[PDB]
């Protein structure tokens, strides 16, 4: 018997108000043939996890009595890295010591342990296995635990919609220092796409620019420069000199920033909106739609990879391999280790409150 | 020889400052084999016509000296109804008395006559021909003169992008009292599509609403109602009771109105923006793109039909048949007849100045 902890809520609301910790049992002596028990290594806090709890994100786990509660309760967290502890008699795809992530969203990763079926999980190579496979790196816990949302988002937006000609064509993105933005710059470099990253001005601007360019952004401009009529010829020349075209815009900001990046595209451009900065709508001039054959659409990795296991698998495999081959780097998380002195839900509540400090990873 | 008049400008600007009327001669008795001489019967004043004159429209006729000016001067007008008066020795597709429209944009329709090739024109049936062939109606001059843009725009937006299920599915549009809006309502009735028309409020709202419903709008709402959060449930219930979905939004306004109609689409909705209400960008909440698989695109009839003569023909033939059958109606134009006692360009200048009165048609 294993006693486990899970972070739950019985009603939607702010995490600081509605979260609690539930102790529950998992019978490791009574595994069904296709069942596996996993023990959590780490799980991050993403905006989507918080919005889910808040009741404003339309993909969420059902409230159930599964954790032995008095009322139906929902678990929390959609991504996480776990270690396989024990497998049932018919399980061949997993064995003890393997690393896994959930195969689907809404699994609930803010907890110490989970019992599921072997197909509720996708195997990642653990460091010993990457090493034995001759790879120069193994995945870190943070890499494994955040692999399933941000890296896939960047990869898919860049490859699944418009085909950019390698060595010629351009994408432009705002939120250039966001997690997805930094992955997009790296993947753009790997795919041989040119890119412009648009970022907020800041005091250490020269250093941030050099850092993004090392990641793979071809050019970096500020939002003031994006807005500036008089800075605008510089950008047209960049694209002209390359011999290609700006075909794709990635928007996670909205408002004036969305306008500014849309206007930099050539004719027949596509914008994908994958995020937003509160009550700031996507704002595009009428003339771009009518006279420049401009299209604006959305991206939501959750919906896209719903009923597309092959696309999910093959994208995941490439991201894993790139970490192993030293070709992709993650932003560092602030790690809080659960040792059992403080209620689990409180580590996550602190993480939520401290979101502006950086990506919060609760580790175990 | 024929003595003709054309409305020209040598410099871009407001029509009231830059237009003048140029006399020119057309060699009546000296047509090349494929050439055609037409007399204008009527040409409307459209916003795009004015925008070309202002120099802020991306598709314009070349400035030349072919009208007998001293400087380069461009003609005016893209839409118009002409009557063939004489044809060259190898023309078989057209004869004297035939009604025709220009086959391409930038023809210059604000003039009394023109010389072209047979392939610069598309034939429409004249009323004598429709009548002789047993049709209950023939085209009026206004119908013919205005057939080439607005009716085709309404037909194509409704049928070429998304397939609406007869009896069940919905489109929503703003500018419901616009020429295109009133065509879309009628086409909606004829093809059994449900529709919501959003219109600005006005002192005679009830009369306008009754009139749009007779043309074929299923429901008519004000912009206030469009902006109301509390009205969402009524719209949701209209769509639920029909068993269909709101799949298509037609936007010619921008700003809050565009937000409003977008929000009323079901998942997987498409917006086509075909016009805009002066410095009001298309404004779409982030959540629609991410969570409702919303797409926003453009519509420009000039670009769509450039190299799709067959789509143009087929569409036009339908509008022509509906007019002959009495199934489609135009909005009545204010007509100013050119008789030689007032300079032609002054008739157009007055029309531009009187745009708020209604569509202006100069006749000959």
Swiss-Prot record, chains A, B:
One of its GO terms (biological process) is fatty acid metabolic process. The keyword Lipid metabolism applies. Its main location: mitochondrion. The keyword Mitochondrion applies. It is found in: Mitochondrion. NADP(+) binds at residues 150, 177-180, 200-202, 274-277, 299-301, 359. GO terms for molecular function: enoyl-[acyl-carrier-protein] reductase (NADPH) activity; trans-2-enoyl-CoA reductase (NADPH) activity. It catalyses: a 2,3-saturated acyl-[ACP] + NADP(+) = a (2E)-enoyl-[ACP] + NADPH + H(+). Keywords: Fatty acid biosynthesis, Fatty acid metabolism, Lipid biosynthesis, Lipid metabolism, Mitochondrion, NADP, Oxidoreductase, Transit peptide. One of its GO terms (cellular component) is mitochondrion. Its EC number is 1.3.1.104. Belongs to the zinc-containing alcohol dehydrogenase family. Quinone oxidoreductase subfamily. Required for respiration and the maintenance of the mitochondrial compartment. Oxidoreductase with a preference for short and medium chain substrates, including trans-2-hexenoyl-CoA (C6), trans-2-decenoyl-CoA (C10), and trans-2-hexadecenoyl-CoA (C16). May play a role in mitochondrial fatty acid synthesis. Homodimer and heterodimer with ETR1. This is Enoyl-[acyl-carrier-protein] reductase 2, mitochondrial. The lineage of its organism: Eukaryota, Fungi, Dikarya, Ascomycota, Saccharomycotina. The gene is ETR2.
